[PDB]
């Protein structure tokens, strides 16, 4: 999948010199076991603790960082696993070894298990939309959102409460044609402990419509509203704290089609970018709580694609075949974070620009800047098989849980790319 | 002389494990050389620093501490350095002499350098006081004092300002009769910028003639008072604060001669113990300055035999022959601390209870406890030869600078002591 990510720190415990675990399964361990499967990559991030010189060296794999001379300095690097066994790290700088700095990675032979946790699957699956509007002329559209409030797994063995619509993030996709009059039923679950409502792009009036869907905690609120312009918009809770509901999940995206329609695609993916500002660090297991602090100062702890860390890698992948064209809805609810989105392998045909669906979409583009509370729809024919790897090229972010596959089946080598000379 | 003192804690400096070097020549210096001469006892104090397993072992000595496992863990231990030449110090810990824990002993030929400072040598002569009264009529005596505020040495390349009666510390050893009047003539240097005065306890009126004496920069005090019983008194400035004119070196000794003399003894000395409470730790060298907060909470850096460190061991060290009766003078200064009196190999035949003259002295005593601002007579026969040292039994002060050395010349072995069986 994905890579296994190790972070150690050097320092001073149990009365040796030695390699300190950090988050995972090897939060404060010393000299922790790393456990990894056969044929993973796996990442190891070394930081210097107390300021002598480091690095760690795997036994048997040829791999190692580099050295690490003063507190703070780091050095990350990878191999991977692919002999089954046990296999010593351990510090080569002189004395460190002996005076305590070993470990020992465990490769074991079949596949990594399931993430787990106590809490609510809460993430959407990339397919789950409407298709494209069928030949129907404008008419009363009848939508339903439900706010829920909800324990939800944000990583393996890692909770969360997540505010949502309809107990997914991002909410359902909405697609309606131009022209359109929307009948809003938004019923809050009676659980709720907050107001929630809903303010859509695609929306014209005020609040974009949240200030007709103030709804309290078992009430239900209706609106009515005229899609008038055709685009690909955002929509999210409109309570204060904005921010806070929309970190907690209520985004989701409404697709106003142009009248004929939108290019006519294979097949068509829902993808949403948000973040979430938990007061421990990201890898840190167990319950998180929000983390104000970290809100309002622009200091994420996870970056996320459709609500959770592998929601579109391990639990719901984007799967196409070669020769289709493919269409991603991609939207950012954020609520900060500017995502300059990239699908690694492949090129976008057609680039939506700011989400406009009736001026000429850009031709030939690698990645696209899209803000917070907009969204874009991208195209592309898969010419050949691979795994294709969603990101946002912001890349720190990939270890904060940002990355998603596209499956692709096929040969590895073709005439499109293939090992060996021409 | 006494012991050679360096104190090395244990860290992460310069990117290595290593030793510090805490005070004396070594302060802050990273695995420092240790200079010392043949034929001295060195003591090396080690204190565990950052919580790994430590010791230091002497490379041809075969001299160790012991263990130290947790941060604040310590061992002292000593050996005497009998062999000119080089010597490696390294920690016997797997791994942590390769990681950086070795440095230094040098065994240089020859006697230690005398202490040297830029500071006045502010310290009483032991030998310094007058010798016994005639067989006289009670008569008037006129003594005169000055209080001056100098710059003096407190240890080798470290210095305070004291503040004295006559420029040393104890102030002048005064002796007088039963009967007798004294005037006394206080003169108050005019670079002085304190007040000063004197309280007598073997005065009788306001303030032990303080209330008379408080003697502005520049000028003069006199003041005549009646001597009227005989003992042992010590006398102090008492301009406010008192303890702090005290530590600063104002105290002195005052006999009172009972009418027929104190019983006839070879040789007579004067000692005074006192405590200085510097903002930098014991060992520290340079400009010291008085710390209030330790002053007034009782934690002394220094204790002191006649006002130095090496006062009475290097500087001017009691002199004695085999078969003298000897008698010292011990008075507390202070301010604060009771001193254990002892002399090491010797036993006081005589001791005057709480500095009374008219009461029989107690008989063969080992130690004997003076209160700050007490003294007390102690007599003794020397039987035989060998370096006798005045110390103050809370043996923790001898490292604080407390120790005296009474030289008695003559064979090592005779009929007293000697090596080897009956
Ligand atoms: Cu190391
Ligand atoms: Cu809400
Ligand atoms: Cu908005
Ligand atoms: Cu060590
Ligand atoms: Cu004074
Ligand atoms: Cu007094
Ligand atoms: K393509
Ligand atoms: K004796």
Same mark, same amino acid.
């Given at each position: 999948?994905?890579?296994?990510?190790?972070?150690?720190?050097?320092?001073?415990?149990? #009365?040796?010199?030695?390699?300190? @675990?950090?988050?995972?399964?090897?939060?404060?361990?010393?000299?922790?076991?790393?456990?990894?499967?056969?044929?993973?990559?796996?990442?190891?991030?070394?930081?210097?603790?107390?300021?002598?010189?480091?690095?760690?060296?795997?036994?048997?794999?040829?791999?190692?960082?580099?050295?690490?001379?003063?507190?703070?300095?780091?050095?990350?690097?990878?191999?991977?696993?692919?002999?089954?066994?046990?296999?010593?790290?351990?510090?080569?700088?002189? @004395?460190?070894?002996?005076?305590?700095?070993?470990?020992?990675?465990?490769?074991?032979? &079949?596949? =990594?298990?399931?993430?787990?946790?106590? #809490?609510?699957?809460?993430? =959407?699956?990339?397919?789950?939309?409407?298709?494209?509007? @069928?030949?129907?002329?404008?008419?009363? *559209? =009848?939508?339903?959102?439900?706010?829920?409030?909800?324990? #939800?797994?944000?990583?393996?063995?890692?909770?969360?409460?997540?505010?949502?619509?309809?107990?997914?993030?991002?909410?359902?996709?909405?697609?309606?044609?131009?022209?359109?009059?929307?009948?809003?039923?938004?019923?809050?679950?009676?659980?709720?402990?907050?107001?929630?409502?809903?303010? +859509?792009?695609?929306?014209? !009036?005020?609040? #974009?419509?949240?200030? +007709?869907?103030?709804?309290?905690?078992?009430?239900?609120?209706?609106?009515? /509203?005229?899609?008038?312009?055709?685009?690909?918009? *955002?929509?999210?809770?409109?309570?204060?704290?904005?921010?806070?509901?929309?970190?907690?999940?209520?985004?989701?995206?409404?697709?106003?089609?142009?009248?004929?329609?939108?290019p006519? *695609?294979?097949? $068509?993916?829902?993808?949403?970018?948000?973040?979430?500002?938990?007061?421990?660090?990201? !890898?840190?297991? @167990? $319950?998180?709580?929000?983390?104000?602090?970290?809100?309002?100062?622009?200091?994420?702890?996870?970056?996320?694609?459709?609500?959770?860390?592998?929601?579109?890698?391990?639990?719901?992948?984007?799967?196409?075949?070669?020769?289709?064209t493919?269409?991603?809805?991609?939207?950012?609810?954020?609520?900060? +974070?500017?995502?300059?989105?990239?699908?690694? !392998?492949?090129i976008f045909d057609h680039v939506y620009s700011? &989400?406009?669906?009736?001026s000429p979409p850009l031709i030939g583009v690698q990645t696209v800047?899209?803000?917070?509370?907009?969204?874009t729809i991208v195209d592309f024919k898969?010419? =050949?098989?691979?795994?294709?790897?969603?990101?946002?090229?912001?890349?720190?972010?990939?270890?904060?849980?940002?990355?998603? /596959?596209?499956?692709?089946?096929?040969?590895?080598?073709?005439?499109?790319?293939?090992? !060996?000379?021409?």
């Amino acid at each position: 999948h994905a890579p296994v990510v190790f972070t150690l720190r050097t320092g001073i415990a149990e #009365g040796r010199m030695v390699y300190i @675990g950090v988050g995972g399964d090897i939060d404060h361990k010393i000299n922790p076991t790393l456990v990894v499967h056969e044929g993973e990559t796996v990442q190891v991030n070394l930081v210097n603790g107390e300021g002598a010189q480091h690095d760690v060296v795997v036994d048997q794999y040829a791999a190692r960082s580099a050295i690490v001379n003063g507190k703070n300095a780091s050095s990350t690097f990878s191999f991977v696993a692919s002999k089954v066994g046990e296999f010593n790290y351990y510090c080569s700088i002189a @004395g460190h070894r002996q005076a305590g700095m070993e470990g020992n990675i465990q490769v074991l032979p &079949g596949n =990594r298990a399931e993430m787990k946790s106590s #809490g609510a699957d809460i993430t =959407r699956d990339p397919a789950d939309l409407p298709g494209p509007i @069928g030949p129907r002329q404008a008419k009363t *559209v =009848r939508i339903d959102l439900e706010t829920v409030e909800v324990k #939800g797994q944000l990583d393996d063995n890692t909770t969360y409460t997540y505010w949502t619509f309809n107990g997914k993030v991002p909410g359902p996709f909405l697609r309606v044609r131009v022209g359109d009059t929307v009948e809003l039923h938004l019923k809050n679950h009676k659980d709720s402990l907050m107001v929630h409502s809903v303010d +859509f792009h695609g929306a014209t !009036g005020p609040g #974009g419509a949240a200030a +007709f869907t103030q709804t309290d905690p078992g009430e239900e609120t209706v609106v009515t /509203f005229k899609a008038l312009i055709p685009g690909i918009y *955002v929509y999210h809770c409109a309570t204060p704290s904005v921010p806070t509901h929309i970190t907690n999940g209520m985004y989701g995206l409404l697709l106003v089609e142009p009248e004929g329609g939108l290019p006519q *695609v294979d097949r $068509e993916f829902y993808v949403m970018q948000g973040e979430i500002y938990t007061v421990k660090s990201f !890898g840190t297991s @167990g $319950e998180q709580e929000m983390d104000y602090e970290k809100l309002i100062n622009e200091k994420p702890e996870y970056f996320l694609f459709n609500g959770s860390v592998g929601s579109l890698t391990r639990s719901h992948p984007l799967y196409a075949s070669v020769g289709e064209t493919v269409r991603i809805f991609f939207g950012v609810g954020g609520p900060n +974070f500017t995502s300059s989105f990239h699908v690694i !392998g492949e090129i976008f045909d057609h680039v939506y620009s700011l &989400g406009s669906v009736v001026s000429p979409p850009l031709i030939g583009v690698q990645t696209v800047s899209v803000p917070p509370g907009g969204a874009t729809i991208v195209d592309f024919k898969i010419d =050949r098989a691979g795994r294709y790897i969603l990101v946002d090229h912001a890349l720190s972010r990939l270890e904060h849980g940002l990355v998603g /596959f596209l499956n692709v089946d096929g040969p590895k080598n073709d005439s499109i790319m293939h090992e !060996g000379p021409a």
